[PDB]
Swiss-Prot record, chain A:
PANTHER family: AP COMPLEX SUBUNIT MU
Positions that bind a 1,2-diacyl-sn-glycero-3-phospho-(1D-myo-inositol-3,4,5-trisphosphate): 302, 306, 315
Gene3D superfamilies recorded: 3.30.450.60, Mu homology domain, subdomain B (2.60.40.1170)
One GO cellular component, as annotated: synaptic vesicle
Tissue: Detected in brain.
UniProt-recorded name of the protein: AP-2 complex subunit mu
Source organism (scientific name): Rattus norvegicus (Rat)
Stretches assigned to the MHD domain: 153-395
One example of a Gene Ontology biological process annotation: negative regulation of protein localization to plasma membrane
Pfam family of the protein (one): Clat_adaptor_s
Chief location bin: membrane
From Swiss-Prot, chain C:
Assembly and interaction partners: Adaptor protein complex 2 (AP-2) is a heterotetramer composed of two large adaptins (alpha-type subunit AP2A1 or AP2A2 and beta-type subunit AP2B1), a medium adaptin (mu-type subunit AP2M1) and a small adaptin (sigma-type subunit AP2S1). Interacts with CCDC32; the interaction is direct and mediates association of CCDC32 with adaptor protein complex 2 (AP-2).
GO biological process: clathrin-dependent endocytosis; intracellular protein transport; postsynaptic neurotransmitter receptor internalization; synaptic vesicle endocytosis; vesicle-mediated transport
Protein topology in the membrane: Peripheral membrane protein
Residues bearing the modification Phosphoserine: 140
Domain of life: Eukaryota
Organismal lineage: Eukaryota, Metazoa, Chordata, Craniata, Vertebrata
Xref: InterPro entries: AP_complex_ssu, AP_mu_sigma_su, APS2, Clathrin_sm-chain_CS, Longin-like_dom_sf
The protein's name: AP-2 complex subunit sigma
Effect of residue 63 to W: Abolishes interaction with CD4 endocytosis signal motif
Name of the gene this protein is made from: Ap2s1
PANTHER family: ADAPTOR COMPLEXES SMALL SUBUNIT FAMILY
UniProtKB/Swiss-Prot annotation, chain D:
Lineage: Eukaryota, Metazoa, Chordata, Craniata, Vertebrata
Residues of the full protein shown: 4 to 582 of 937
Sites bearing Phosphoserine, chain numbering: 1
Coiled-coil positions: none
UniProt keyword annotation of Transport present: yes
UniProt-recorded name of the protein: AP-2 complex subunit beta
Biological role: Component of the adaptor protein complex 2 (AP-2). Adaptor protein complexes function in protein transport via transport vesicles in different membrane traffic pathways. Adaptor protein complexes are vesicle coat components and appear to be involved in cargo selection and vesicle formation. AP-2 is involved in clathrin-dependent endocytosis in which cargo proteins are incorporated into vesicles surrounded by clathrin (clathrin-coated vesicles, CCVs) which are destined for fusion with the early endosome.
Species in which this protein is naturally found: Homo sapiens
Tissues expressing this chain: Expressed in the brain (at protein level).
Amino acid sequence: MIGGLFIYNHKGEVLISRVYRDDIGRNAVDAFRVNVIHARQQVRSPVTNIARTSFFHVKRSNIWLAAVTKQNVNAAMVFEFLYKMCDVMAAYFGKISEENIKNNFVLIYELLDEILDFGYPQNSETGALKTFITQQGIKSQIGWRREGIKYRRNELFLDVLESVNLLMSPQGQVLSAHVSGRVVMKSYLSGMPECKFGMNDKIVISIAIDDCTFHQCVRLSRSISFIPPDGEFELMRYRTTKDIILPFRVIPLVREVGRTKLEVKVVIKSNFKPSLLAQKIEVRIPTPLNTSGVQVICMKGKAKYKASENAIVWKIKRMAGMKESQISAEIELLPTNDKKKWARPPISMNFEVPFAPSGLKVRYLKVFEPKLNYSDHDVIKWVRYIGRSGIYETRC
Amino acid sequence: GMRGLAVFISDIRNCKSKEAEIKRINKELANIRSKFKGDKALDGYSKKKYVCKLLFIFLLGHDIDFGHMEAVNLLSSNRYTEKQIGYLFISVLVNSNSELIRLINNAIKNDLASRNPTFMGLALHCIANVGSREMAEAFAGEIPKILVAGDTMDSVKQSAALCLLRLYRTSPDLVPMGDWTSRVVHLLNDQHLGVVTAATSLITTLAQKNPEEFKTSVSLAVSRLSRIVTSASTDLQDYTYYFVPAPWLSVKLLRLLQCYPPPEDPAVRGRLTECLETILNKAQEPPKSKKVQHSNAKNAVLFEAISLIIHHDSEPNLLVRACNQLGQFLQHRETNLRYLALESMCTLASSEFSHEAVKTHIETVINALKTERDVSVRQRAVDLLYAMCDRSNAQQIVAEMLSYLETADYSIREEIVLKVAILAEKYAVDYTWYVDTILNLIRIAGDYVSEEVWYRVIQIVINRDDVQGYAAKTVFEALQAPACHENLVKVGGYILGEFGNLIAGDPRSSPLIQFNLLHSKFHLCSVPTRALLLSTYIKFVNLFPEVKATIQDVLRSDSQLKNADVELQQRAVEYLRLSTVASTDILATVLEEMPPFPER
Amino acid sequence: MIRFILIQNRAGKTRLAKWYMQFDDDEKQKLIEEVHAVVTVRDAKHTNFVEFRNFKIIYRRYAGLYFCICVDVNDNNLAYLEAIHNFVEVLNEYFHNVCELDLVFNFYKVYTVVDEMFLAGEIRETSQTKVLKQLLMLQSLE
Amino acid sequence: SKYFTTNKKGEIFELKAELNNEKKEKRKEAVKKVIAAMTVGKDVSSLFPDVVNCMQTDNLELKKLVYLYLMNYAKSQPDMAIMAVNSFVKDCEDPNPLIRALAVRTMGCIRVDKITEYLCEPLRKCLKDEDPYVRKTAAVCVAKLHDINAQMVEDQGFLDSLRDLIADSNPMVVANAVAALSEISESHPNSNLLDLNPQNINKLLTALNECTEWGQIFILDCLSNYNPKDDREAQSICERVTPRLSHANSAVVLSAVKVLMKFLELLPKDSDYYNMLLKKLAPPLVTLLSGEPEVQYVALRNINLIVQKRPEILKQEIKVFFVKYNDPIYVKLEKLDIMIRLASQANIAQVLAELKEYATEVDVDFVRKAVRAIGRCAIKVEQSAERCVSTLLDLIQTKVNYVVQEAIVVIRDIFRKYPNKYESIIATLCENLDSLDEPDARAAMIWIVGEYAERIDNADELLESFLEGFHDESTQVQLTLLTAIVKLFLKKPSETQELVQQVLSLATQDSDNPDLRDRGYIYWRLLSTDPVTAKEVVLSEKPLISEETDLIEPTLLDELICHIGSLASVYHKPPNAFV
């Protein structure tokens, strides 16, 4: 019925676990870590099915709770049970955070025993668990905007401007990757309005460390409440390191037969929807310095040589998604030095895409002006995501 | 040593919660803040213990914003424990209080002026650990002078050379290339091997930008290496690791040689070659231990040596001996060893001299590939397979690659199919080989094959055809297994709709059952596949009128002409109106044999 | 050259962390987390050389602890793994069959050993006997 | 080798030494430290025996701790755990019933072969016990024993006692045993869980009201598998189950709806009860939209099915299924689909306006869904299509890009559905041509130009604009551009000669995709032999098209409506598709 219960922290490591039916192995926990939490573009759903198994998961402010089962279990029962459990946890030690869990391991096992038997959620009213639980948890604990602004036509525009940074190893292992971005908001409003703005959970509130700084106006309580200043400004800056959605994947192939011939093929794959369009792509391929000449062949965009710059350049006017393109090149080397083993530098790429590589998506926006009349229904809003290549390199 | 520290750490380890721990730490911090701000002067012992507690707290993860004053006061003491704790603290917590920087420069100047090599050791260690530009300006003028003076004790010489290295990496401008070159390179003949260790590392990192100033190092390098390798078992007893004579010194010495061309002195060159050959020979005897340590230690030197030979690339006999040893490695327990051998063969495959040598071990390579359990190992092996495929062995390599695809796991399919496609396009000696390989690849793992690949195979079939029965039967059979997937449906549908006159003879290849295959694949394929199928349908209707009714019976379904998509129903209407009406003979002038594809 | 040395148990708690490059505190915590996460998921059949942001990691588990040395990608691998074993044996000899609790209670000498055998990102001494003698010589002062 | 493993100094040795103090209070914190160590991943198996040495204790809390330890070992390494069965069996008889229950459930937790001979005596013992809680545990232990490999013909005496349990006194007892037995029956011998319909069902339904929040779900799921025979039987059943609007809003209400809609086969209008049910079902189905988000997701994925089956109930509730700004997206989608399903001809007045609002939010994909929902609405009430296209024109005039694209993609469908009824709009679409990028929209615009070519004397330049940038465009736009250019040729010859040469050639001589090459040559021969058949072969009236997809199979619907509350519904797939 209830195959096995698990509690994870936001990093994705098992804070605690307890299984109930041997038909659930290590593969289960690994699958729920690599197929739901670390899922990238999948449309989320509080009930998911993989490899003939089903998962239910509830999010509590940073903590994932999940139940896994293979039977045709009564669905509503799962979620009512999870809510009862989160409530009992609260009643024993207040809010739910990593600290309380790591500090009441014993109580958590006591619960997962008593409340939940073999998968059959026996009585769980907190007033009555004193009978069976004997432990005890441990609790712990304007000026920027003129008033008198008049416009004839309400408008606003949100731009999620992000920059992605990537450095990958020839066998396709993602070595380094992080996205730094900011939410620039340009408005045109009449009066002193309130605004409520909410988004998804991909942004928590020479080494990339996650971060999220606001503007002085922002106010928290999840969501965002604020009174925008007139004109253009910056709402929040942030930096993320996980679950990134690498637009292009570059695969290199290099064969250095002899010390005079050197052949290099590159193939780029688009890893996103087939209707979008990445624009203005550039690939910079390196070459050893004692390189006499080059032969290049490509059926997408156009490439040429830059001897002074010491690189081959390959431009792409536009490109779709889920497709594959390829450039070939042969290289004759001037055998001057019988030395100096060429430590080839990485292959770089520049590109612009109309979707936030970090996975951010503007969930919802309400604009409410009290003293005057209008509301969200009466203001025109535009949204634009712009993700740009930062340092985007592939070891070849 | 210090009981208070122990009880402190024990109480910390008995905290039941992060809040209780952080409270206790704030408490101890308040206490030590007070006693440091207390007007009472302090005893050296207490100051030592208190800075110890501070360092511990900092190491657990919190913040500490004081104490460095006592850290300064603790350098002028003369008990070793105090000097140790003080220099440790000052090294761990980096801060830019200019006054404290000056004080520390003063204290370290004093210590280096002293004569106890222990104090000199601590001073050099601290300088090497922090290494600020200011400590540079304060000691980079002196350090080589400490290194070259004859009476300086051993450990002093070691640590001083290493600190000169640290200086060189941090601040290159503040170490002038003066006279000490001769004596620093002469360091190598010392009996204390550790001196040689330090001197070698330093000389490597220096010569990486001024070779012509250190060229005189290679002679001593090769002499020491020879004396090490031809050594006896009970030589260098303090410097021998599990019956292996001086590994690390050999590693670093070979590394030093790697920064230089081949030696220019003939006798030097010859002794060097003899050393290398000695290493390789020693690599072939049975082990003197059942313990992994001996294997790792010896193979370290072995890999270093072969990498050096590659950097030289002038000893063909040595190259091929190396390759043969490597090939012997490929079937080994130590996954480390297998990975490393693969990695090194990857670069050896680039030689004018060891190419065929690498080629010969191909069956070992493929057998390792066909059963290996790691993913990185398999990736490296496939890449090697790529690296040694040429006019000679391409056919067998490709065949084995496909035969592996026949079962290989998901984690490799993408690059395997990419590389097989590229090899096919590169060395296909004839059409029929090319088409055979491509079609098999598609049948096996189409859903990764590029868009251009099967464009090309259909194009080439259109041009130099003579494979029509083969292609037709292949797609025919691959279809009736219930697994056939898209790109196969596309390519086969098109090609048999073009050339089914050459397969319709088999009683199990009827036009009727051909359509039954294609329709059985219809209700699972997407819309462009469906469009291709509908074009092949009318091509058939032109050729084999024997299902001319039932095909139309399908074309009239609610599923066809009421089609949600536009282009499906567009083609459906056009074809139904072509067939049932509006002609029955001009069909032969519209559905002709698709004039051959022009040469781009 | 070495970048940083870690002695780290299964919980992710760091018993010893000695750096050889300029890194701020936050990024120090970050690198520790990344290395622990990439190392605790391998098995005995897995290799020992795992690539990392701009370096590689040479690690070895000793049944309760992990030794991890961060190395530049173009350096030897087996040599550094064996140096790890060498230093482990030095500890084992000095501390009389070292246990992790000792590595906690006695950090101010663990640092001594570490700087004795490694200094400024290279391998200083290799002979266990001379290091042991230096150590028990220093342990006699006052 | 074996460094760092000595047990004369360090953590494990210190704990082991602690575990032997004779002050029980310290032993408590000792084993607690051990448990924390197990959780964090520290190897503590070395502690095993002495921890079991601590089981010899009168205290409740200490024995509870050690049992938690052994449970932690149970599912990971059973053989290790077995080494305390000598005490386990010397645990099922103590005072303090909590001890008894704990022991029974723990023994059952073991999954090894030889446990049965150890376990057959205690388990069969405790079924017949004074205490309720113990029987509540032992019932579960029975199923535990069944899932581990055992048919264990004593299992027949077990099942005897088990059926004897359904005639229990305490609610939670039957509330649990019914679930245990139902789970047994699913790995299915055909001779299992016989329903003594009158007597047993009366007893079940008497115990239902006293039951605990949870067991009522299982009671209802056991009833669901029952199949009645006579009318007044079903009358009485539905009567007794009726008052379910219970506290566990998500579960009890849903499963009650399952048992009802399965027991809805009566003479409908002979008695005014069919009406009574069809009336009573609406308030709970509505109030199941005020709870937490996930419950709302499940309730919606079931109400969708219900609407598919019995639309008479929710025919007038299209207000409560509106989208609020702050819901999770996986709820907005379900609300949108249900709104389309309920879109009658009477309430469009608000519906077609409500959607007009959603097309001004910021959640892009949801806005796409709303525009296409307007579309699908314009195909389910014909008497509103004009207002539909009007609202779409408004949305286009908003000039928002990612709205105008879905707008035009729907307008194409509209035109193709009701042909020749909105032809004045066509020209106005063209002025919004520069801002079309996605393939769907480009194709749909070019297709609209395809038909109705004789409406615009500017159709030439329109397609000449795409003709230049022919590559770098999907195959869809290429093929549709072919069809459209030819359609323009046959309708306006002598002015397309400039086009149908370069279009055809750029499709056939240049492009590599052999399928476009094929269609190119096909069209080439038609328009070269005779312009007399070209018309009748290309320009035929493509018959009307209905969205045949938007309905679910009736017998599949029968199955799912037999599985309303379970996980089977939320996927809309039969239970066989996952074991």
